[PDB]
Amino acid sequence: LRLELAVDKMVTCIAVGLPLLLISLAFAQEISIGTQISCFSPSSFSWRQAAFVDSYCWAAVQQKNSLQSESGNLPLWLHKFFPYILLLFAILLYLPPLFWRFAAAPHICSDLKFIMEELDKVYNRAIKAAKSARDFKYPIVEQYLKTKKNSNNLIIKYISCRLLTLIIILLACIYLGYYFSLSSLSDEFVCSIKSGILRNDSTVPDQFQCKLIAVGIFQLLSVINLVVYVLLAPVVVYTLFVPFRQKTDVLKVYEILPTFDVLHFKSEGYNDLSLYNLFLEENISEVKSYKCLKVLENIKSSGQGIDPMLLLTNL
Amino acid sequence: LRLELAVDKMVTCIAVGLPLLLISLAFAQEISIGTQISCFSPSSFSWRQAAFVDSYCWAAVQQKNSLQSESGNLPLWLHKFFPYILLLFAILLYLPPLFWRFAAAPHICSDLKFIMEELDKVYNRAIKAAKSARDFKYPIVEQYLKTKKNSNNLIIKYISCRLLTLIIILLACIYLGYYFSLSSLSDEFVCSIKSGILRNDSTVPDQFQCKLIAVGIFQLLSVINLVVYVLLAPVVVYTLFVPFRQKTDVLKVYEILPTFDVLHFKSEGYNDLSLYNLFLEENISEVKSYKCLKVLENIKSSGQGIDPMLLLTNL
Amino acid sequence: ELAVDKMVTCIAVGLPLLLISLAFAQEISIGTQISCFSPSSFSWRQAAFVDSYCWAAVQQKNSLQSESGNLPLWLHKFFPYILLLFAILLYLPPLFWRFAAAPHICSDLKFIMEELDKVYNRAIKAAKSARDPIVEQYLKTKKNSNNLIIKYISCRLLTLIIILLACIYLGYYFSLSSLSDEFVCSIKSGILRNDSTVPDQFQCKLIAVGIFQLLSVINLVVYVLLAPVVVYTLFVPFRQKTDVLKVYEILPTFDVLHFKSEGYNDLSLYNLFLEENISEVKSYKCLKVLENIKSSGQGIDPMLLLTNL
Amino acid sequence: ELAVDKMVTCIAVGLPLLLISLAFAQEISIGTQISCFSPSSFSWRQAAFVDSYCWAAVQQKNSLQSESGNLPLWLHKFFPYILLLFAILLYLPPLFWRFAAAPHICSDLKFIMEELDKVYNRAIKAAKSARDFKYPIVEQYLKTKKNSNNLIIKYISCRLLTLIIILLACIYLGYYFSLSSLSDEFVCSIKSGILRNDSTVPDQFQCKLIAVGIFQLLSVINLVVYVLLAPVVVYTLFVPFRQKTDVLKVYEILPTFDVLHFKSEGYNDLSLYNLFLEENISEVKSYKCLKVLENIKSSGQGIDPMLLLTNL
Amino acid sequence: LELAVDKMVTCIAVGLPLLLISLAFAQEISIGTQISCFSPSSFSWRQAAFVDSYCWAAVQQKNSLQSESGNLPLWLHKFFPYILLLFAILLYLPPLFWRFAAAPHICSDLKFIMEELDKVYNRAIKAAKSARDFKYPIVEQYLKTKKNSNNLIIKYISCRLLTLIIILLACIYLGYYFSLSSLSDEFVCSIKSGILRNDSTVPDQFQCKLIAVGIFQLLSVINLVVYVLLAPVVVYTLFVPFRQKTDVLKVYEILPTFDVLHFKSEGYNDLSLYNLFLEENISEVKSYKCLKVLENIKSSGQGIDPMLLLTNL
Amino acid sequence: ELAVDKMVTCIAVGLPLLLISLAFAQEISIGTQISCFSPSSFSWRQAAFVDSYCWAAVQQKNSLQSESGNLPLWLHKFFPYILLLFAILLYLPPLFWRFAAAPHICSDLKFIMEELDKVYNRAIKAAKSARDPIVEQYLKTKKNSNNLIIKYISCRLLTLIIILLACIYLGYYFSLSSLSDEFVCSIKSGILRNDSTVPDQFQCKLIAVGIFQLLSVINLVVYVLLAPVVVYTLFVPFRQKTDVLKVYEILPTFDVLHFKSEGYNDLSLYNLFLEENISEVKSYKCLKVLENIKSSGQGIDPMLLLTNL
């Protein structure tokens, strides 16, 4: 009852923990030198006057009139808001898995548990009929899967959460590629504390050379995040192609039972049946009847004996 | 017994954790530079005199006589009390859930557990009667359903907590939209430490140019909170109109039981019955009898066999 | 603990604590709580001495001269501990209640619920055999002594008294003037008295006062909103409604008598606690199902009881 | 632990702890606990040395000269530790009695409740057989409890130590609370060792112990709460006075139970057991039903054995 | 679900870089900032702080700093802490298979094999008990089938091979750090871009030194030593066939209800992996325990096979 | 994990960790780990540069000149981590023991206990009917291969080897002169080489090295007290005694044979683990009650066993 495919669990783990791990690294007790901005006030300035210049320019990356930067004010905005953008991406990437687990999870589980119980029951009834021969009959699970072939609401939830995950991953790739595509000189901006009563003041110099520290770390981490995300996006796209992944028809092994109709009827659709096929292919190893039937099916590759006889021997 | 609808749990989680997360972000070490205010005392001022000017003006954003600001004293008040406002909204948004958690639960959880037990019992009795055929009778829960429609005690509590949540969310949206609408130059105010014995003092200048730092971060976070809240408000509203959300009649699947009267009788009212319908639609997946009955109902879409026979096979 | 009482306790206790932590948190604070503006000639440590001396000197009335008086000065230092004192005093009655009051009402309520389940079982067994008042006297006794409830209304009355005293204190401090933090201070006792390098007086200002007043008005608003709730909760008889035992009157093994209303006696308190905890009683749930069905009046009470099983 | 004893412990222990935690509020403390006002010529580190030296020198009586004396200085510097000491000493008797005395009374009380339920069952069974051994074992057990008071002597001893420690704390807080309010200011001289004949260092420094006023304002609060708590302990100290509403009197209407209360008037373990029975007796179902019959008997309409048989 | 040698290889290869990161930045070994630049005496405190932070950020901008070794050694130190964590994460990723729900791929089949072995043991002793008073080798056929596809094991050798590749890449990277002279921290720095370019009060260049780099190299050599000790373990663990000896089944051949055939050896196929996992988890099987008791007794030959089987009951 | 092994692990691992945490106590540590005494003319930041340069320069042998040598300087700075390395290496064998060998012995021991309870039940059932050796062969087999125990003595031997290496290192480190923490450092590489305002050499001293030596001698004392314990634990045969299965020999359904002694084989290890975990076995407890009684002769063994029920 995991209700989360291993590839989906790992995609979520990566896409969420990587921006968080990178945020935590960008401010390691060993990577931050100190403040995020330094402005180089004149030597005549006192300690507190220099602190004022630093804090003023930090707050002044927003006020476009005060600061003059060669690259523009937009790089300054992006440099100051550096860590917020990654936590936002982590949260947005965590949202679709949360929507999946909160509502979609429970619905998928009940049906799969019922299908496994019905398969075990049909196996028991088939071997009991075979045992009585050695001494109703309605394909209920087949009809249930035929019904699942119709409504795709159960799957559309899955491909929708995967599609939002892919969209957010692509938007994060775009943002990180832009941010890394930084000038790497745009962190140096000229700042002027000359609004208000300081405007015509003379002891204060006209402009200060400020630099936004710990930016290079942001870009080096953004390229790492972008690489991992462009490696992750094909995985999500493949996860999206849910019918293509439905392979090795799991119910085909049950077709050798008399109490089971000879019909797979599970393929070719953007419908909940393909999703159920994937989840059955995953959780079917827990089904003992499936295990024994697959043993007989593999033996049938040689073709030495016969299916009903072998089943009777297994008991 | 979660006793909280998934949409309500997520609305609470968002509306409460988002202001808390934003408070915690607004003072992340990388994000802040130092003090919340800086005042630029003259160069002749000692370190402690400049500290006095900073702290005095910080405390003087309240005393309207001391500070002269172009935007007014109200922006100064709003800038100083940025953090306090965020927590208060989180608490008020968490207050409704707390009342629901303790006051609301006895009325509903007990009733829902009783309804689920009665449904399992009627299912068992119906299959036992069917099994005896293959070899009292009072609709107590249905009588119970009528009470829900006539009783709004367990509902009016729900729509009241939801309505207070919506009202507080709208008040938070109004406050955040106002705060974000602040001048962004209103963080610079002129401050004069000239009350008391300093009034006619000469070494102290007439006025100081103070600037409130960490206000741009407050506005950037307030717009995020406002966006998330105006996205959340339709969800709460959507939520307020329960009569509309009561859909996919859950008891309709039980109408195929002989031991159960053929009557849904659950719709169209601002009464506790609609609330109970929502909570049943949520918690009904835990009911095994409901799961099996829904399996039979979905199979009935094809119409191959028959309802009582299918039930007998399931046993 | 009744839901309204639990929420009143939660508010009246956590609000002063949350408000202390608001102002209390280091990030919210600019720095020290007092700043005194020593002269420029003073060294760093001399200015620190002036600050700390005046901070400790808001008590010594001889040193400081303030226009409003020494009481406003003492009030500021008092407030961080005064809010915690109010939180503790407001937590005390709920603590006394759970420690003493619940044990007496808990045993009685558990016994009443067990007796109700037993009478229901016996009634359906008699009805089943046909198809084939100890609890009332106990409640009549509860109708007499109000000592069991007197504990409840006493803890509620102390809660109301402490809430009103907190409202008075918070309203008093909030009006103030705010010029008190601007009161002067003179470090001229002892050997510094006739010293000349030290100025006669310093202009000190109490840091983070405005935050205290803005939070005190919030606490006062919430408390004057909470006081009517306690007063309503104070009146136990009014809240006793939707007679819970009336649903049991349809049992043959149960006498036809509610006999639970109209008094400042422990019976009304027990009625409230029964109305709260009665949903746990399965027999009450089934009986209420039958009673709601009886609104339509289609069948009959004993038949549905027997049929319901 | 009786509710009044639990609340007395909670107050007497948590109040000094809460007051310690308040005395060091991140908003009531201006900074260091002492400030000494070195001369202007002194560097930052020299002034720090003067502060720390005088802080450590409130003990060395030769260095500091104070008008009130060295004892106020000691009390001003060791104010916290003393409150924690009082909290610990006040927590000790509840720890002691709970560890050993509790189980002794718990086993006996559980046995008494079981025996009462058994005698009730036997009485109604005899009455039921009439509608269709005999040894007062619990009465004899309580008669025995009436003898040795050692089981209760533990209780009144822990209560008496609690009262003694509360009174000692009241005395200390009243003494400490009633301060000169000038003591916080002491003259300190860093002139021992090689600094003795040094000339650049002044003869004496004016030090002040900051946040002492907070200590006194909190000590008066602690003293008020403690002198309000002491009458509660004294009342709780007197076990015999507390007992009332004879709980076993309701059982006297049973045939299988002898007609004898025999529980009153002594500084013996029987009175303590009476209190604990009065507390824990509501859990006893037989007691509940018997009290129902006893309250009905106030009207006197029917009869005790008939209503008991009808009780079932 | 994770072999003890694999669990310990993961624990080492992951926790060692993390422990070394945590050690490198311990208060007792860190003196303070990671860089110090020695501004002139005329510079104020904040001007010196600006020089330090500027040069720290300027190890990237190649135009500002002039170092004898080059800019690559400078960039290596700053990213060294990040690499330690990157290597830990990449080494944790393959074990991620164990973390993920891949247990059913191997354990569920194992659970079936153990149940079938207990069942065949019970049936054999019941037949022997009836003598004292179907018959299809299903598990043998299942293992014969496992002897076919090696896809189930290919997952295992693939995660082990990625672990080995990442360990070797980490060894290569760490080897490099130890090899470097690291005078790199002594590289000069010039705060003369922008308006400071033609400024005169600021000196032409500053002598900066990178703090905690000697600690980084001393820890990198430790990590490299542990990793080159760990790589042979992974290589041995890589060879699943060379890792299998004394198969558990050879003890079940003394049962009448069990065919006389081990048929489990010699292949890069899932059968060898299942043999390893059976050798590990077989001690939980009670029937295996009793059969091994009889097999060990058979070394002496004092007691008959079927007789001792029936005798044990 | 045997109690002596658990305590040896706890000591050998937590002691270096506790000592690391003590060496850097806030009261204990004064500040930085190095101080260099720049001239008075040097600014604050120039002195900080000298400190940090010399800290990083304990490695570069050309810069610093120390009387003891550069190796003591390396050991000074690397001493804190070295203790964590010893803690980790000492934790490794117990960790290996938990996964590699503990389950192998756990399954076997649980099976032996179950078989002993079963044989006891069968013996008393046979005795009860009168009133109205699989485990031995398994242990005989264990007497063969010592591979199961070889894991145990191997983890113990690695623990002893690492403890002895730690003793050697700590005895060497404590044998430092305690003046080797004072080294002369010269910031004169690069453009500072021919600079004149900077003095030729600085007198630096390594902070918290006396604390390191005082803690290293404590660690060495505890480790040389622990090493004999490991050596004794190393000899499994010398430890086994009080033959635990001898109490079972009084059962008819159990063969009269202890057959557990005298070998560097897994049987002795299993004997130790049985002696430890056998108190959980109820049948063993009753047999020891009566097994001891049989020696006394007060009552006969089968009669008391039947009476045991």
PDB file of N, CA and C in Angstrom, chain A residues 67-112:
ATOM      1  N   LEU A  67      20.724  53.114  -7.101  1.00  0.00           N
ATOM      2  CA  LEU A  67      21.832  52.292  -7.565  1.00  0.00           C
ATOM      3  C   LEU A  67      21.946  52.380  -9.079  1.00  0.00           C
ATOM      4  N   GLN A  68      23.181  52.390  -9.569  1.00  0.00           N
ATOM      5  CA  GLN A  68      23.480  52.373 -10.996  1.00  0.00           C
ATOM      6  C   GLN A  68      24.340  51.152 -11.289  1.00  0.00           C
ATOM      7  N   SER A  69      23.792  50.208 -12.048  1.00  0.00           N
ATOM      8  CA  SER A  69      24.492  48.980 -12.387  1.00  0.00           C
ATOM      9  C   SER A  69      24.553  48.825 -13.898  1.00  0.00           C
ATOM     10  N   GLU A  70      25.685  48.313 -14.385  1.00  0.00           N
ATOM     11  CA  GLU A  70      25.861  48.134 -15.823  1.00  0.00           C
ATOM     12  C   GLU A  70      24.894  47.104 -16.388  1.00  0.00           C
ATOM     13  N   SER A  71      24.654  46.011 -15.660  1.00  0.00           N
ATOM     14  CA  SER A  71      23.773  44.967 -16.174  1.00  0.00           C
ATOM     15  C   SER A  71      22.307  45.363 -16.047  1.00  0.00           C
ATOM     16  N   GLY A  72      21.965  46.111 -15.009  1.00  0.00           N
ATOM     17  CA  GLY A  72      20.599  46.526 -14.765  1.00  0.00           C
ATOM     18  C   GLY A  72      20.147  46.192 -13.354  1.00  0.00           C
ATOM     19  N   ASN A  73      18.924  46.627 -13.052  1.00  0.00           N
ATOM     20  CA  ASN A  73      18.382  46.410 -11.717  1.00  0.00           C
ATOM     21  C   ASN A  73      17.813  45.006 -11.569  1.00  0.00           C
ATOM     22  N   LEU A  74      17.385  44.405 -12.674  1.00  0.00           N
ATOM     23  CA  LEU A  74      16.866  43.043 -12.622  1.00  0.00           C
ATOM     24  C   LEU A  74      17.894  42.041 -12.115  1.00  0.00           C
ATOM     25  N   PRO A  75      19.154  42.049 -12.565  1.00  0.00           N
ATOM     26  CA  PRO A  75      20.133  41.148 -11.945  1.00  0.00           C
ATOM     27  C   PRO A  75      20.284  41.385 -10.459  1.00  0.00           C
ATOM     28  N   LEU A  76      20.184  42.635 -10.014  1.00  0.00           N
ATOM     29  CA  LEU A  76      20.304  42.920  -8.590  1.00  0.00           C
ATOM     30  C   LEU A  76      19.150  42.306  -7.814  1.00  0.00           C
ATOM     31  N   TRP A  77      17.926  42.489  -8.314  1.00  0.00           N
ATOM     32  CA  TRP A  77      16.772  41.832  -7.715  1.00  0.00           C
ATOM     33  C   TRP A  77      16.977  40.329  -7.640  1.00  0.00           C
ATOM     34  N   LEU A  78      17.446  39.730  -8.733  1.00  0.00           N
ATOM     35  CA  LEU A  78      17.605  38.281  -8.768  1.00  0.00           C
ATOM     36  C   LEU A  78      18.698  37.821  -7.813  1.00  0.00           C
ATOM     37  N   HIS A  79      19.727  38.645  -7.615  1.00  0.00           N
ATOM     38  CA  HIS A  79      20.810  38.266  -6.720  1.00  0.00           C
ATOM     39  C   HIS A  79      20.380  38.363  -5.266  1.00  0.00           C
ATOM     40  N   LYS A  80      19.597  39.384  -4.925  1.00  0.00           N
ATOM     41  CA  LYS A  80      19.146  39.503  -3.546  1.00  0.00           C
ATOM     42  C   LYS A  80      18.151  38.408  -3.195  1.00  0.00           C
ATOM     43  N   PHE A  81      17.247  38.071  -4.111  1.00  0.00           N
ATOM     44  CA  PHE A  81      16.243  37.039  -3.827  1.00  0.00           C
ATOM     45  C   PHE A  81      16.670  35.594  -4.129  1.00  0.00           C
ATOM     46  N   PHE A  82      17.955  35.298  -3.961  1.00  0.00           N
ATOM     47  CA  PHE A  82      18.545  34.056  -4.476  1.00  0.00           C
ATOM     48  C   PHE A  82      18.047  32.722  -3.890  1.00  0.00           C
ATOM     49  N   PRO A  83      17.912  32.661  -2.556  1.00  0.00           N
ATOM     50  CA  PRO A  83      17.491  31.474  -1.802  1.00  0.00           C
ATOM     51  C   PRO A  83      15.984  31.248  -1.802  1.00  0.00           C
ATOM     52  N   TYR A  84      15.212  32.325  -1.871  1.00  0.00           N
ATOM     53  CA  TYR A  84      13.759  32.216  -1.874  1.00  0.00           C
ATOM     54  C   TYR A  84      13.272  31.451  -3.098  1.00  0.00           C
ATOM     55  N   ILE A  85      13.896  31.720  -4.239  1.00  0.00           N
ATOM     56  CA  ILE A  85      13.532  31.072  -5.492  1.00  0.00           C
ATOM     57  C   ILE A  85      13.702  29.555  -5.467  1.00  0.00           C
ATOM     58  N   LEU A  86      14.649  29.055  -4.675  1.00  0.00           N
ATOM     59  CA  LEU A  86      14.872  27.615  -4.629  1.00  0.00           C
ATOM     60  C   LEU A  86      13.888  26.929  -3.693  1.00  0.00           C
ATOM     61  N   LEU A  87      13.600  27.535  -2.541  1.00  0.00           N
ATOM     62  CA  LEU A  87      12.603  26.954  -1.651  1.00  0.00           C
ATOM     63  C   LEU A  87      11.225  26.950  -2.298  1.00  0.00           C
ATOM     64  N   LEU A  88      10.914  27.986  -3.072  1.00  0.00           N
ATOM     65  CA  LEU A  88       9.646  28.026  -3.787  1.00  0.00           C
ATOM     66  C   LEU A  88       9.555  26.882  -4.782  1.00  0.00           C
ATOM     67  N   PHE A  89      10.647  26.622  -5.498  1.00  0.00           N
ATOM     68  CA  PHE A  89      10.650  25.506  -6.437  1.00  0.00           C
ATOM     69  C   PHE A  89      10.518  24.178  -5.710  1.00  0.00           C
ATOM     70  N   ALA A  90      11.181  24.038  -4.562  1.00  0.00           N
ATOM     71  CA  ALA A  90      11.044  22.814  -3.784  1.00  0.00           C
ATOM     72  C   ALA A  90       9.602  22.602  -3.346  1.00  0.00           C
ATOM     73  N   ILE A  91       8.947  23.660  -2.877  1.00  0.00           N
ATOM     74  CA  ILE A  91       7.564  23.547  -2.431  1.00  0.00           C
ATOM     75  C   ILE A  91       6.642  23.204  -3.593  1.00  0.00           C
ATOM     76  N   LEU A  92       6.762  23.924  -4.707  1.00  0.00           N
ATOM     77  CA  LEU A  92       5.924  23.638  -5.865  1.00  0.00           C
ATOM     78  C   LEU A  92       6.158  22.232  -6.394  1.00  0.00           C
ATOM     79  N   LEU A  93       7.381  21.718  -6.269  1.00  0.00           N
ATOM     80  CA  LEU A  93       7.642  20.363  -6.733  1.00  0.00           C
ATOM     81  C   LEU A  93       7.126  19.335  -5.740  1.00  0.00           C
ATOM     82  N   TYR A  94       7.007  19.719  -4.471  1.00  0.00           N
ATOM     83  CA  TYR A  94       6.413  18.832  -3.482  1.00  0.00           C
ATOM     84  C   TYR A  94       4.896  18.816  -3.560  1.00  0.00           C
ATOM     85  N   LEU A  95       4.295  19.856  -4.130  1.00  0.00           N
ATOM     86  CA  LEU A  95       2.835  19.939  -4.158  1.00  0.00           C
ATOM     87  C   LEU A  95       2.158  18.811  -4.932  1.00  0.00           C
ATOM     88  N   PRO A  96       2.572  18.447  -6.146  1.00  0.00           N
ATOM     89  CA  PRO A  96       1.873  17.372  -6.867  1.00  0.00           C
ATOM     90  C   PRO A  96       1.969  16.031  -6.155  1.00  0.00           C
ATOM     91  N   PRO A  97       3.132  15.641  -5.613  1.00  0.00           N
ATOM     92  CA  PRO A  97       3.146  14.402  -4.819  1.00  0.00           C
ATOM     93  C   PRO A  97       2.236  14.465  -3.612  1.00  0.00           C
ATOM     94  N   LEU A  98       2.092  15.638  -3.001  1.00  0.00           N
ATOM     95  CA  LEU A  98       1.175  15.775  -1.877  1.00  0.00           C
ATOM     96  C   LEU A  98      -0.270  15.607  -2.323  1.00  0.00           C
ATOM     97  N   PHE A  99      -0.632  16.229  -3.447  1.00  0.00           N
ATOM     98  CA  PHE A  99      -1.976  16.060  -3.981  1.00  0.00           C
ATOM     99  C   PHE A  99      -2.249  14.604  -4.316  1.00  0.00           C
ATOM    100  N   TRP A 100      -1.232  13.907  -4.807  1.00  0.00           N
ATOM    101  CA  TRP A 100      -1.380  12.502  -5.159  1.00  0.00           C
ATOM    102  C   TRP A 100      -1.625  11.652  -3.916  1.00  0.00           C
ATOM    103  N   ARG A 101      -0.736  11.772  -2.938  1.00  0.00           N
ATOM    104  CA  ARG A 101      -0.848  11.001  -1.706  1.00  0.00           C
ATOM    105  C   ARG A 101      -2.102  11.313  -0.888  1.00  0.00           C
ATOM    106  N   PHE A 102      -2.464  12.588  -0.795  1.00  0.00           N
ATOM    107  CA  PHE A 102      -3.634  12.977  -0.011  1.00  0.00           C
ATOM    108  C   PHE A 102      -4.974  12.436  -0.515  1.00  0.00           C
ATOM    109  N   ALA A 103      -5.197  12.480  -1.826  1.00  0.00           N
ATOM    110  CA  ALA A 103      -6.469  12.005  -2.376  1.00  0.00           C
ATOM    111  C   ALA A 103      -6.403  10.767  -3.276  1.00  0.00           C
ATOM    112  N   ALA A 104      -5.500  10.787  -4.251  1.00  0.00           N
ATOM    113  CA  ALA A 104      -5.368   9.681  -5.200  1.00  0.00           C
ATOM    114  C   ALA A 104      -4.939   8.348  -4.584  1.00  0.00           C
ATOM    115  N   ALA A 105      -4.009   8.404  -3.638  1.00  0.00           N
ATOM    116  CA  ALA A 105      -3.489   7.202  -2.987  1.00  0.00           C
ATOM    117  C   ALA A 105      -4.556   6.223  -2.496  1.00  0.00           C
ATOM    118  N   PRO A 106      -5.421   6.671  -1.573  1.00  0.00           N
ATOM    119  CA  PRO A 106      -6.449   5.760  -1.051  1.00  0.00           C
ATOM    120  C   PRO A 106      -7.315   5.074  -2.108  1.00  0.00           C
ATOM    121  N   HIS A 107      -7.729   5.796  -3.143  1.00  0.00           N
ATOM    122  CA  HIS A 107      -8.578   5.205  -4.173  1.00  0.00           C
ATOM    123  C   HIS A 107      -7.901   4.064  -4.928  1.00  0.00           C
ATOM    124  N   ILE A 108      -6.633   4.254  -5.274  1.00  0.00           N
ATOM    125  CA  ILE A 108      -5.873   3.244  -6.005  1.00  0.00           C
ATOM    126  C   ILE A 108      -5.670   1.952  -5.216  1.00  0.00           C
ATOM    127  N   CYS A 109      -5.397   2.097  -3.923  1.00  0.00           N
ATOM    128  CA  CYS A 109      -5.140   0.957  -3.048  1.00  0.00           C
ATOM    129  C   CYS A 109      -6.296  -0.032  -2.900  1.00  0.00           C
ATOM    130  N   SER A 110      -7.489   0.478  -2.614  1.00  0.00           N
ATOM    131  CA  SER A 110      -8.649  -0.381  -2.412  1.00  0.00           C
ATOM    132  C   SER A 110      -8.882  -1.273  -3.625  1.00  0.00           C
ATOM    133  N   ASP A 111      -8.854  -0.688  -4.824  1.00  0.00           N
ATOM    134  CA  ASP A 111      -9.079  -1.467  -6.037  1.00  0.00           C
ATOM    135  C   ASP A 111      -8.013  -2.536  -6.218  1.00  0.00           C
ATOM    136  N   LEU A 112      -6.752  -2.206  -5.948  1.00  0.00           N
ATOM    137  CA  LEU A 112      -5.682  -3.169  -6.154  1.00  0.00           C
ATOM    138  C   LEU A 112      -5.764  -4.297  -5.140  1.00  0.00           C
TER     139      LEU A 112
END
